[model samples]
Target chain A: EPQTLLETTVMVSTKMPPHEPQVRPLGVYVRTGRGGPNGVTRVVLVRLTDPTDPFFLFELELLEDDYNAFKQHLELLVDFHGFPRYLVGMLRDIADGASAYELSFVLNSGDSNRGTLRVLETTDFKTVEHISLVLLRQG
Target chain B: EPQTLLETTVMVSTKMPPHEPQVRPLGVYVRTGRGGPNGVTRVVLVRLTDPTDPFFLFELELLEDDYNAFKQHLELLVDFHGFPRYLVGMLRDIADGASAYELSFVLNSGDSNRGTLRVLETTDFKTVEHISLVLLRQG
Candidate 1:
C-alpha cells in the first residue's frame, strides 16, 4: 500500500538578502522505489506564483550518493550572486553537507531573478542535472 | 531566516489493487496565500517510466477549509470506474486527532488509471481547491 508521508509548506523567494524573506509554497515528496539501484529519488516542486517575478524555474538532479547524504541532513542556505553562481555554494553544501555556512553576494545587474525549483534525484550522483524551464510548470 | 519544513516520500502506482501494488516516485508541493482569497494550490507530478504506458498528469487544488480538514487526517478512499470516473474522497479525521482508521477500495477502472498525489497545506483553514492532472504511472 503506497501511503503519503508528509505534506507541509515550502517557500521560494527571489528577494535578495537584506530584504525580508518572502516565499511561495512548495510541495515535497518521495517514493521508495521497488528494488532498484536508486535507493531514494527526492522530488520537490516550488511555485512561481507571479509570472513576472524576476526568477525562473530550474530542475536539479543530484547523484544518488550525494542525495542520500543530503537527505540525512535538512538545512539549506540561500545566497546567489545571480543564477548558477549562487548554486555553486548551495550545491557544494548539499553534496558535502556543510553547516554553519554563510554567504553574501552582490545582486549584480539589478536584474534580480526568482522562480521556483523542481528537483528530482535518481541513480546518477557525480553531477546534478537541471533544466531551465522558466514557465514550464504548466501543461 | 525561513527554513524548509517537511520531507518525505509518496508513491503512485498504475497497478490496480490486488496486483502487488506497483508504485513510482511522486513529488508534491503547495504554497499558502496569506491575507486574501487565492487560498492554497496543491501540485503533484507523476511520470510513466514505460514508453508504452497509457496515462497523463492530474493537478488538483482544494478549498482552504477542506485542505485544513484533509491535512488533519491522511487516508483516502479511491473509487473509480475509469478515467475521471475516480472519485477522490480525501478522508479526514483530524483536529481532535483520530487514529487507527484504515479502509481500502478496489481500483475500478475501465481502461485503468492510477497515480499518487502530493498536497501542502496552509496556516489558515478557509478554502480548499484541487485540479486533476492525470498522467498514468506505470512500469
Candidate 2:
C-alpha cells in the first residue's frame, strides 16, 4: 500500500516584475487579470512573516508583458483568506486607490518559499472604479 | 484606513481529462516535469481531504494543451514546500519507480475554495518515464 504523506508550510516574498527576482517559497500562485489600455501587465509579490503572526508582508507589484490573456483558472486553487494580516493589508491597499498590491505568507516550519500576486487594470480605472465581488470565503 | 482581507482554505479533487470529476480528500501535488518526448507540457490534479491532516494522496496524471512557452517567472510567488502531503507524496512516488505523481491541499475554511494539481502528459508515459526534481521547500 502507498504510505500517506505528511505536510508542512513555508513563507516567501517578491519585488514584482521589472525590479528583481526572489523566488523563495514552497508554493507559487500567479493570478493574471484582464489587460489594460496601456497594454502592460501588473504583478504583486506578497511575503508574510508568519501565517498566524503576520507582522511583515512584501508587496511587489507590476511586470512588463503585452497580452490579452488571463490565467484566472486559479479561482479554486489558493484561498486568499488563509493569511489574515497579509490579505487584510492587500484588501485595504486596493480600497485606497492603489492599482495593485503585494502579499506574502510567512511560514512557521519547513521551507521558506516566496511568491507574489498581480492585478492588471485599464486606464479608465481611476475615473470609473470597479470591483469584482467574487470568490470570497465565508465562515 | 482601508480594512484588510481575511482568508480561509478549501479542498478540491480532479477529473483528469477523459475521467469523470472525483472530488475527495487527501492532498495532491503535481510537480511539472521537464520537457518530455512529445515535448508536451503537462500538469496533474490530485485530491486532498484536510490541508493539515494529510494522510492519503493520489497520483492521477496526463492532459492536453498547446504552449511551447513556460511561465518560469513565478519563482518569487509560491512555495512548493507549503503543501507538505502533496509535495512529499510526489517525491516518494518518484523514488519508488514512478517518475511522477500528483498532489492537493484540502482546506476546510473560508470560501471552501477547492483546488487540485494537474499535469499535461501524452497517452504514453511508461515508454518515457522522465522527471524533473525542481521546486521544493528548504527550511
Candidate 3:
C-alpha cells in the first residue's frame, strides 16, 4: 500500500531585486513513496548553501527524536541573508517543542541565466542520509 | 464631545554608510495643527543633500503627475561610475506611483560639507494648500 503526501513546492525566477537584490519566486515539489510491512519512509529534498556564484543558496535537515546539536545550523538558515528571517521566528515559536521543516531554494536573478533543480528520491525514515543538490546552468 | 487626543514625540539618530561618501537617510512625517479653519497643516521630510562642502550635486524637480519623468530621475540616483546596470527594473516600480513629495538637498555629492534636514510636519487628506520644498544646506 502507499502513504499520503503533504506536498510542498519552491520556485525561483529571474525576477528583479528590490531596491536591493530581489528575485521572482517559484515552487518545488515533494511526494511520498509506498509503504509496506517494510513501511520504510524517506526525505525528498536536498539542502545547500555555498554555491560557486552564490546566485542560489539552500540547506535542509530532518529532525529526529534524535541528536540536539544538529538543530543549531538549521536555526541559522531561518535567520538572515537572502532568506526570510521570520522562518526562524516561526521555528522558535514551535520549539520542544522545537522547529522542524522540509525546505528548498530557487536561485533566479533577472540576468542572462536559466537552470533547473529536481529531487529524484530519498532514503528510508531512519538513519542519516546525505541531502542531494543538483544545479546546472543553461542558456 | 470632540475627539480629545493629542500626543507628540521626536526621535533622532545618525547612521554611517558602509562605504565612504555615504548619504544619510531622511525620513518624513506629517501633522495636523489646531483643526479649526485657522488650523495649519503640512507634509514635510528634511533632506540634507545640499552641501556647503560644494561637492554635492542636485537637480530639483516639480513634476505634476509626470511619473515617468520621476522614475527617470530616480534611476539617476545610482549614477555612479561603478553602479550596477541590472537594477533598473526594480526601480521602475517605485517611480510608477503618483505622489506629491518635496525633495530637499543635504549632502550634495554633486558638489561636500553636508548638513542635516529637519522635516517640520506634513498634511494629507485634501487639506494642503500646496507642497513646499527648499534646496538649502549648511556645512
Candidate 4:
C-alpha cells in the first residue's frame, strides 16, 4: 500500500488578509477572524482527500512556471504578517523604518502528504508554540 | 505578533508519468527506512535552505531541467533524495529511463525575499527508491 508522502509544521506571522478572511479555495476548512489586525492571525486546519482537488492548485500551477514570480509573490504574502526575526532584525537595523518591521512565517502550507495545519494565535502563543503540531504524531 | 497559517494538506498518490497508477499520494505518518528501499518507492523530496545557513532553509528543491545540461553546467548544489517507489515506478514507465526529474521551484536568488533554482540529484542511488518527507506541522 502507498504510505504517507510528506508532512511538516511551519510557523508564520502574518496579518489576516481580510476581516473575516474568507477561504478562496473552499474545501475541508473554514475561515475565522478571531485574530484582529494588531492581534494575531489564524489559518484554520483542514484535511483534503480529493486528488483532482482545486487545492493549492494555484501554487502548484505557479511553481510550474519555473520562474521567480512565485518568490516575489511569497514576499508580499510574508510582508502581510512580519518578516523573520533573524533576517528582519538586520533589515530593521540598517533599513530602520525603511522596512521598519520584522517578517516571519509561523506556518506553512501542508505538503503532498498526510498532515494538518492548526492555529494558536492566542495569548499563550509562546507557550503553545512549545507544544503541538498539526500532524503532531507521525502516525 | 501574528497568528498561524497552516495553508492546506492534499493527499496525492504520486505515480509514474506515462500512466497514472490506481493509487496516489496517500497514507498518514509512515516509518523511516533502514535499508533495501524500506521506504516508499515513489516521489522524492527536495528542499533548499539558505546556503549560508541550514537552520532557515526550505527543504524541498525541485529541478525540472534536462540531464546533460544539468550534469555539465550545474553550480549551486542542493540535496534531492529519491525512494524506491518514486524511482521504481518511473523506471517501469519510461524506456529511455530518465536520469532526471524536474520539480518546478521559485527562481529567485540573492535577496531576503529572493527566490532561486534548486538543482538536486544523487551521484549514484542504487537501493533507494522513494524519499520520505516528514509532513510538516501547520505552524
Candidate 3 lDDT, A1-139, residue by residue in tens: 2222222223222322332323333332222333334545332222222323454433332322221233332222221111222332322332223333222323445352432332111212111111223343332
Q: Residue B134, candidate 3: how far off, in angstroms? A: 14
Model 4, range B4-90, lDDT digits (tens) per residue? Answer: 111121122322233443322211211222222443332233223333333433332123333234322322132222222332333
Note the clash tally of each candidate: 41, 62, 45, 55
TM-score of each: 0.20, 0.21, 0.24, 0.15
The candidate, 3 or 4, that scores higher on TM-score is 3
lDDT for A62 (candidate 2): 21
The local distance difference test score of each candidate is 0.30, 0.30, 0.28, 0.26
Rank by lDDT, highest first. Answer: 2, 1, 3, 4
Q: Which parts of model 1 have CA positions greater than 4 angstroms off?
A: A1-139, B1-14, B23-54, B72-139
Docking class of 4: incorrect
Model 3 docking grade: incorrect
Recovered native contacts, candidate 1: 0.00
Candidate 2: tens digits of C-alpha lDDT, residues B1-139: 2111111223234343334555554333434433445755444322223465533333333232322122132121213223223334444553344643333222222333332343211211111111222222111
Chain A TM-score across all models, in listed order: 0.26, 0.21, 0.24, 0.19
RMSD to true structure for each model, in Å: 21.8, 21.7, 18.8, 23.8
- TM-score of model 3's chain A: 0.24
Compute the lDDT for candidate 1.
Answer: 0.30
The parts of candidate 4 lying over 4 Å away from their true place are: A1-72, A75-77, A84-86, A89-139, B1-68, B72-139
RMSD of model 4 against the true structure: 23.8
Clashes of 3: 45
